[PDB]
Structure formats: C-alpha cells, structure tokens
Amino acid sequence: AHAFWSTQPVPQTEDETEKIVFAGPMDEPKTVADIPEEPYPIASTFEWWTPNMEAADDIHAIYELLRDNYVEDDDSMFRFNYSEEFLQWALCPPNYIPDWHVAVRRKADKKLLAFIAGVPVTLRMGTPKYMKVKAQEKGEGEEAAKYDEPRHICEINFLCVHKQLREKRLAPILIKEATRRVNRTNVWQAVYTAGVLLPTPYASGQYFHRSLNPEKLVEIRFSGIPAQYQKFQNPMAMLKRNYQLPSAPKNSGLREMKPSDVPQVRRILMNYLDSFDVGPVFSDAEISHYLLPRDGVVFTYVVENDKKVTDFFSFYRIPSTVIGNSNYNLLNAAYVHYYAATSIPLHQLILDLLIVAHSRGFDVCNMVEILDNRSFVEQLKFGAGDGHLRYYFYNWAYPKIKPSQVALVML
Ligand SMILES: CCCCCCCCCCCCCC(=O)SCCNC(=O)CCNC(=O)[C@H](O)C(C)(C)COP(=O)(O)OP(=O)(O)OC[C@H]1O[C@@H](n2cnc3c(N)ncnc32)[C@H](O)[C@@H]1OP(=O)(O)O
Numbered sequence: 001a002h003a004f005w006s007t008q009p010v011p012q013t014e015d016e017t018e019k020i021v022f023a024g025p026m027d028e029p030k031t032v033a034d035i036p037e038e039p040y041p042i043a044s045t046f047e048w049w050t051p052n053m054e055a056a057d058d059i060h061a062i063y064e065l066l067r068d069n070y071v072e073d074d075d076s077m078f079r080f081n082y083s084e085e086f087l088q089w090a091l092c093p094p095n096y097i098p099d100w101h102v103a104v105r106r107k108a109d110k111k112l113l114a115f116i117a118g119v120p121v122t123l124r125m126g127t128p129k130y131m132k133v134k135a136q137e138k139g140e141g142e143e144a145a146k147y148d149e150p151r152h153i154c155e156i157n158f159l160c161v162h163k164q165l166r167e168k169r170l171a172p173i174l175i176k177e178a179t180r181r182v183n184r185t186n187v188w189q190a191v192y193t194a195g196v197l198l199p200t201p202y203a204s205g206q207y208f209h210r211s212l213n214p215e216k217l218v219e220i221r222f223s224g225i226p227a228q229y230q231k232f233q234n235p236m237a238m239l240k241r242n243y244q245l246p247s248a249p250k251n252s253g254l255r256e257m258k259p260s261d262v263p264q265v266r267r268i269l270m271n272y273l274d275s276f277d278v279g280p281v282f283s284d285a286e287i288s289h290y291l292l293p294r295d296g297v298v299f300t301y302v303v304e305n306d307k308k309v310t311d312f313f314s315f316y317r318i319p320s321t322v323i324g325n326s327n328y329n330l331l332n333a334a335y336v337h338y339y340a341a342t343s344i345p346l347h348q349l350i351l352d353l354l355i356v357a358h359s360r361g362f363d364v365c366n367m368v369e370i371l372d373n374r375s376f377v378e379q380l381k382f383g384a385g386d387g388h389l390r391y392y393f394y395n396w397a398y399p400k401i402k403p404s405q406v407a408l409v410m411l
Pocket residue numbers: 001002003004005006069070071072154156157158159160161162165166167168169170171172175178179182183187188189190192193194195196198394395
C-alpha cells in the first residue's frame with residue numbers, strides 16, 4: 001500500500017506505534033562517511049538545483065512554483081500563496097544550511113519541477129511524561145530517559161511537485177536526496193507535518209478556525225451561512241454580529257515586540273514550553289528571528305504595563321489564492337504562532353490576537369489544537385474544521401501523544 005513509505009525508517013502501523021514505550025531511533029545511525037557525496041540518481045533529463053533563499057530572484061522562482069502548485073483545499077477553491085518575504089524568513093533561520101533547500105529542474109527549458117526544504121530545529125523529543133511514569137512503575141527509568149536532552153534535528157516543509165509531474169514518483173526521489181544532504185551533516189532525524197495521513201503520526205490535532213470577516217468568507221465559499229442562522233430575518237447580519245470584535249486591544253500596555261524584549265520573551269516561552277512533551281528550544285537568536293515583527297509575515301505583541309514583559313502572543317500570515325471569484329483574489333489568514341501568559345488568562349491574551357488580526361484586515365484566524373489552544377476555543381468562538389494536522393518523525397520511535405502535549409508550531 002505504500003511503495004515508498006514502507007521502505008523508510010518510520011513506524012508502519014498503529015499496532016507497531018502502540019508497542020513503542022521509549023523515545024529513540026528506528027535504525028541506529030551510521031556515520032557521515034557511510035553517506036555518499038555523489039547525489040542520489042536522477043533521470044538524465046532532470047537535475048538537482050540548490051536555490052539561494054536569501055537571493056531575491058531564487059526566492060521568486062520558488063515563490064512561483066508554490067503559488068501555482070502548493071497545497072489546495074480539498075475542493076480546489078483555495079491554494080496557499082506564501083509570500084516571498086515569508087519564504088526567506090521560514091527557510092533562513094539562524095545557522096540554516098543552504099544545502100537543505102533542494103529543487104529539481106528540467107534541463108531542456110530549466111523549468112522548476114519540485115522543491116523541498118529543511119531547516120535546523122532544536123527539539124525536546126524524549127520519552128513523554130505518561131510513558132516515563134509507566135517506565136518508572138516497572139524499573140525502566142534509565143531506558144526511558146536516554147534521549148531527554150534537546151536534539152539538533154531537521155524540520156522539513158514545503159514539499160511540492162509541479163502539477164504536470166504529479167504521480168511520477170518524483171517526491172520519493174526528492175525526499176531521498178534531502179535525506180542524504182541532512183545525513184551528510186550528521187543529522188539522522190527529522191520532524192514534519194501534513195494534512196494527509198501517512199505511516200505513521202505520533203500526534204494528530206484537528207484544525208480550528210475563527211471567522212473575522214464572515215461576509216467575505218461566505219462570499220468566497222470558505223464558510224456558509226449556518227442552518228441555525230436561517231431562522232433569522234437577516235442571517236448574515238446575525239452572523240456578522242456573532243463574530244464582531246473590538247476595534248482596539250483591551251490589554252493595557254500591549255505593544256509590538258522589540259529587540260530588547262528577546263531575553264524575557266525567551267525565558268517565559270521556554271518555561272511554558274517545558275510543560276509539553278515535544279517542543280522546540282530557541283536560543284536568543286532564534287527567538288529574535290522567529291518572533292520579532294516582520295511586515296506581512298509575523299506579528300508579535302507583548303503585554304508590558306509596568307516595564308516588565310509578562311505575556312506575549314504571535315501570529316503569522318499566509319494568504320491563499322481564491323480561484324475564480326469576481327469580488328476577491330485572496331483569503332488573508334492569520335495562524336496562531338507561539339504565546340505565553342503569566343499575568344492574564346490565555347483567553348484574554350488571545351482575544352487581543354483576534355482584535356489585532358481583524359484590525360489588520362485578516363479574514364480568519366486558524367490554529368491546530370496543540371499547546372493550550374483548546375483552553376480558549378469556545379469563549380473565543382473558534383470552531384473545529386474538517387481537517388487534521390498530523391505530526392511525524394523520520395527515524396524516531398515515539399509513543400503516541402495527545403496534541404495538547406505538542407508545542408512545535410509548524411509554518
Ligand atoms: C534525516 C532527514 C530526513 C529528511 C526527510 C524526512 C521525510 C520528509 C517527508 C516529506 C514531508 C513533507 C511535509 C510537507 O511539506 S506537507 C505539504 C506537502 N505538499 C503538498 O501537499 C503540495 C501539493 N501536492 C504535491 O505537491 C504533491 O502531491 C506531493 C509532493 C505532496 C506528492 O507528489 P505526487 O503526488 O506527485 O506523488 P509522487 O508519485 O511523487 O509520490 C508518491 C508518494 O508520496 C507520498 N506523499 C504524498 N503526500 C505526501 C506528503 N505530504 N508527505 C510525504 N509523503 C507524501 C505518497 O504517500 C506516495 O508514497 P507511498 O504512499 O507510495 O509510499
């Protein structure tokens with residue numbers, strides 16, 4: 001049933017996943033010297049290409065491939081349109097490895113056919129709490145603790161094959177050549193997400209959405225007017241009213257994050273993320289990169305009412321193309337990114353995320369039920385969607401965890 005994934009170092013079934021009780025590799029690593037420098041074989045009419053994702057024109061080339069060929073909804077009405085500025089931000093964090101950005105080009109016309117990207121991540125990926133207790137109950141704490149220390153691994157995203165080259169087994173070749181480039185740097189695990197089910201997730205969270213401009217969302221067919229609103233004389237006025245928000249934030253001393261806030265934001269974020277089984281560790285440089293505001297890309301605010309940052313939230317922007325609507329070309333979506341609350345309840349913090357996003361022309365706010373995202377869903381009028389983000393590891397056996405024990409936000 002899986003001609004490629006049955007050949008890879010990942011758990012193959014839920015039955016196998018259930019027997020996993022410690023974190024650790026699926027296959028013990030070889031060494032860099034065991035990995036060839038000759039690139040993986042590719043058809044003589046194609047070639048590997050490493051774009052430079054800090055050079056505007058190479059960013060633009062990958063931007064067009066993804067604009068025209070990256071993820072669509074299931075009814076082909078919307079397609080992600082990640083911006084050029086977002087792509088440079090996502091793929092060039094501190095200490096990134098240019099060789100982990102891998103493309104395929106057709107030699108005759110130089111057409112860009114495919115892309116995949118890795119970036120470094122420092123991840124806590126040791127045995128989860130509930131399995132550490134089971135191990136202690138049996139005298140097996142040492143086996144369960146062996147990989148507790150954060151690991152420097154690869155985060156994969158942006159796999160894309162051009163629509164003309166679909167279903168030709170190009171994706172497995174690109175994944176093998178990315179795996180070779182990562183293993184040549186002595187890294188043997190990766191983490192990745194997908195909205196589709198593959199062998200085999202270690203966690204799965206449902207999508208949630210919070211309408212900010214319901215009239216546009218119903219116009220472009222992201223949403224409908226729900227049945228319950230058809231009982232009113234003006235169903236769309238009632239829907240607008242249900243989703244209406246303040247026009248300015250409610251927390252005193254909310255402001256955009258500044259470079260001087262990086263140490264405090266790091267401290268309160270890392271203390272919060274320790275409560276979860278799987279989560280990133282960020283240096284000052286990585287907090288700077290991933291959370292300082294960037295126009296059109298990442299939005300981050302801190303609560304500092306009395307000269308101390310006590311709370312913060314972030315969100316990132318991905319517009320989607322709307323195929324074929326005469327009123328609108330884009331669906332402008334905000335995605336909940338990292339946050340931490342130490343002085344106010346989380347629903348009070350995230351209400352200001354929704355107010356800032358709506359004020360800035362966002363149409364919807366999206367999130368997965370990771371972190372403590374479930375703790376504000378009903379009061380803030382998020383509703384579950386009909387999709388799930390599944391979390392995977394490459395070459396890492398991991399006991400199944402609930403999505404409220406995941407703290408890695410995917411871009
Ligand atoms: C140590 C370092 C390790 C580094 C690498 C770690 C692993 C990283 C893994 C990648 C993480 C990516 C994270 C993201 O970016 S998730 C976003 C993925 N991108 C899209 O959905 C964009 C639109 N779709 C496409 O561009 C293509 O349909 C893709 C490229 C998805 C497949 O191209 P195509 O449709 O032309 O098919 P094929 O004939 O070439 O290949 C068929 C094989 O591909 C398997 N497939 C389908 N979808 C996915 C998917 N989302 N993750 C992994 N595998 C996937 C499929 O089960 C089949 O295998 P098997 O069922 O026969 O066994």
